A paper describes a structure:
Siroheme is the modified isobacteriochlorin tetrapyrrole used by siroheme-dependent sulfite and nitrite reductases (SiR/NiRs) in catalyzing the six-electron reduction of sulfite to sulfide or nitrite to ammonia. [name] is encoded by a gene fusion between a C-terminal SUMT (CysGA) and an N-terminal bifunctional dehydrogenase/ferrochelatase (CysGB). The N-terminal enzyme module, CysGB, is a three-domain bifunctional dehydrogenase/ATP-independent class III ferrochelatase12 that performs the final two steps of siroheme biosynthesis. The C-terminal enzyme module, CysGA, is homologous to a well-studied class of SAM-dependent uro’gen III methyltransferases (SUMTs) that catalyzes the methylations to generate precorrin-210,13.
Author numbering:
A (entry chain A): 1 to 270, 277 to 457
B (entry chain B): 1 to 270, 277 to 358, 363 to 455
Write the structure that this text describes.
């Protein structure tokens, strides 16, 4: 990230503003609302500063910039129209390892002053890095049209109850479950807004009275095929609240960037499923919200049922969040719909990597008016070409291979069935093989890109 | 306002973390990502720190907290389990006027770390006071769901173009209206993400050349099978930016309640397909962002392809957001995995204007999933038995899969016909050995 947002406690900390015009005024206002001990150093001051100075809210130092005025400061702001002065200020601040904002020069400073949405104690800060004030001036408006009006009063009440919640609930999990119920009680929000303390307290006492479930849970979450935007809403909720997210190589890096930062991430890509099961098992037996994050959909060649049968055996709760399976994601992002008109009346999702014993039912797979989708079939692509041809599928059946479907690295190669073995040599795992007439739709429906 | 949020440029700035456990590793990850020149000081280090240190990404100092390690720091983080140490760090940073965070005591020092939505250079930070973090999580999660993850590339490119937009749009209102189109333009965002420097320029000139009123494009969005939680993030993001949403009855009311309040809504449910197609281009050529919301996934028995063909020949930009098809939705919510071990080598999604292959449908080691097959269900039981499928083959009908009205009836194929009329549209018929797994995997209840 370009910047690290921090929320500074400025009470009783010296800050210096250099400059005395309307810009310094706006910054001085913010720093005063944060309770900073403020010194303003400028040649001239607009009348608001003398008003603030007369009320003892800051110190004016009339004159050119005084480097020494930084010696005890925690923040500095150069807010003059003189870029030469502003650089002297920045330089002085740098030597003293003081964070410094140059208002007219966001990239030149150290810190940047974001747009603020004040719903004290709830604070939301927005900045497009100062390079684009428009989006800050605009996303701030969007967020302001997002946060409920009385979110501050709910958050204020939450702060008043924090001590009591910490006393009555020993573990982080319990407190989290209380907070979850607390923040979605609409009646409580409204009783807070109405200053209806009878109602506040009734709802509150019942809240604390509720037994909390202490069981861990394992949620199987379909990551989707790679594009972070194809995680479902519920899947995002699950990984934004997980304590442990167990994931493999088929969960994209962009999906993993939506896993809350406080989650423990456990990589189980290359292991024996018997050890995965017990990793899920052990962490859920510890009471934690465990997410098994899997590429695609958990129940399509996912080994997902296998983990769950052991959790069920161990009395561990679990749910499943479906995901966009590789077939749907590749379909949408390659412009190859899995069904169309009468191109295809059925879709077959088939594994290539089959159990050591036995092979596929190739006569069955060679049936017309199907779209075939082979999962992990790359190494068997030649065998699939051979078999499909040999059980009667037309030699010129369009085939497409989608590598890293839905990601920026998506690559599509396509051709006819007789090219399948050769096409698969051009892509790598992870790749889907689509066989069927719908592949010819790519040329009218491809909206994504060409690698 | 009890905290001043500031966004720190930490690249090449000495920052100190004290602690070497899981908490410190999370702060250290964050500070590494922000570019901090990082020293970590701890009695011991979990192996992730020795990995980062071998890679020269930070400096480890093993042993008691050394106050002099702060001598040139900009930021300090007390990330130990030891209150005594954290206060030693906090006091030593306070005396040196180094902003300092005590992870487990947000009121104990000079800054707290907010929840971050990172879309660099666009960043949103939310905090309401630390330790628990639920309110911040709820806002963060909601914002994570509303801010496309590439939006930072859009924001970066905007700052480059800021000079060009002014010397074309004279009034700030015009500039403002331009910027609103700019930041929601899908093809710009996907071109930037895909590094397609061709499609960027094309999309930029189109944004500068086409009228400030035109934003005409159709997005095919898969609503998923019913549960509003099964909409994708992109789907949510698309229906929030829609000027007009075209939907039918297979899009749940819950999905429809996610729709931007000022959007026009066009119901095309019970309407032959040609009139729907016409509606979509008719709206897209009026310069409006059109979302066609379709139940499940748009490209699975949705006629999604046919809608886009009308548009592609008309020069109207479009995209497709895939959805949770009924099969996978119902599978997850009925505890019937479509595949499992050696039960089924393949899954077949099949509909209920031609013919249907029965001996093919009857073959072993498949999971059959019939869409729109409730009317043809008596035939289904007859034909599959008549083509060799064993009598005891488990069958299930899943009606209103993933909704709070979901009903699952299950038995064997020999009861399938009677099980069918016991259920109404919209419903899937699932046939296969995986159906028996519902006893141990049914969690939806
Ligand atoms: N992004 C992607 N692009 C193409 N194929 C993918 C893919 N992600 C997963 N796959 C396919 O899925 C196989 C793994 S099997 C697990 C698939 C997952 N459960 C799903 O529902 O999609 C890989 O061998 C590959 O064929
Ligand atoms: N919630 C649901 N539960 C069970 N079946 C559903 C369903 N929603 C849609 N269907 C099935 O889908 C059929 C319409 S065909 C449209 C399917 C959609 N494009 C998808 O991908 O799921 C219905 O007849 C019904 O059998």
């Amino acid at each position: 990230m370009d910047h690290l947002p921090i929320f500074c406690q400025l009470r009783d900390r010296d800050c210096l503003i250099v400059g005395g015009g309307d810009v310094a005024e706006r910054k001085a206002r913010l720093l005063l609302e944060a309770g900073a001990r403020l010194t303003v150093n400028a040649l001239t001051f607009i009348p608001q500063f003398t008003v603030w100075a007369n009320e003892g809210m800051l110190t004016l130092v009339e004159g050119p910039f005084d480097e020494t005025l930084l010696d005890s400061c925690w923040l500095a702001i150069a807010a003059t129209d003189d870029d030469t002065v502003n650089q002297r200020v920045s330089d002085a601040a740098e030597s003293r390892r003081i964070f410094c904002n140059v208002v007219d020069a966001p990239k030149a400073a150290s810190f940047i002053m974001p747009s603020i949405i004040d719903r004290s104690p709830l604070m939301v800060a927005v900045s497009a890095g100062g390079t684009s004030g428009v989006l800050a001036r605009l996303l701030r408006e969007k967020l302001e049209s997002l946060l409920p009006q009385h979110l501050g009063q709910v958050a204020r009440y939450a702060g008043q109850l924090r001590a009591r919640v910490k006393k009555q609930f020993a573990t982080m999990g319990e407190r989290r479950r209380f907070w979850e119920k607390f923040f979605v009680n609409d009646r409580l929000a409204q009783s807070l807004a109405n200053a209806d303390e009878k109602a506040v307290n009734a709802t509150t006492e019942r809240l604390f009275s509720e037994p909390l479930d202490h069981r861990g849970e394992v949620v199987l979450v379909g990551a989707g095929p790679g594009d972070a935007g194809l995680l479902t809403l519920k899947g995002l909720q699950q990984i934004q609240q997980a304590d442990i997210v167990v994931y493999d190589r088929l969960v994209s890096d962009d999906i993993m960037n939506l896993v809350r930062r406080d989650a423990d991430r456990v990589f189980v890509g290359k292991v024996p499923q018997e050890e995965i099961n017990q990793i899920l098992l052990r962490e859920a037996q510890k009471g934690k919200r465990v997410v098994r994050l899997k590429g695609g959909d958990p129940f399509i060649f996912g080994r997902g049922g296998e983990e769950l049968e052991t959790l069920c055996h161990a009395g561990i709760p679990f749910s499943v969040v479906p995901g966009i399976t590789a077939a749907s994601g590749c379909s949408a992002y390659s412009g190859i719909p899995l069904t169309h008109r009468d191109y295809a009346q059925s879709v077959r999702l088939v594994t290539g990597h089959l159990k050591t014993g036995g092979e596929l039912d190739w006569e069955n797979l060679a049936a017309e008016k199907q779209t075939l989708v082979f999962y992990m079939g790359l190494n068997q692509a030649a065998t699939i070409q051979e078999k499909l041809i040999a059980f009667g599928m037309q030699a010129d059946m369009p085939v497409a291979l989608v590598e890293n479907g839905t990601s920026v690295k998506q690559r599509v190669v396509h051709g006819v069935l007789t090219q399948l073995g050769e096409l698969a040599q051009q892509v790598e795992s992870p790749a889907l093989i689509i066989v069927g007439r719908v592949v010819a739709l790519r040329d009218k429906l491809n909206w994504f890109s060409n690698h």
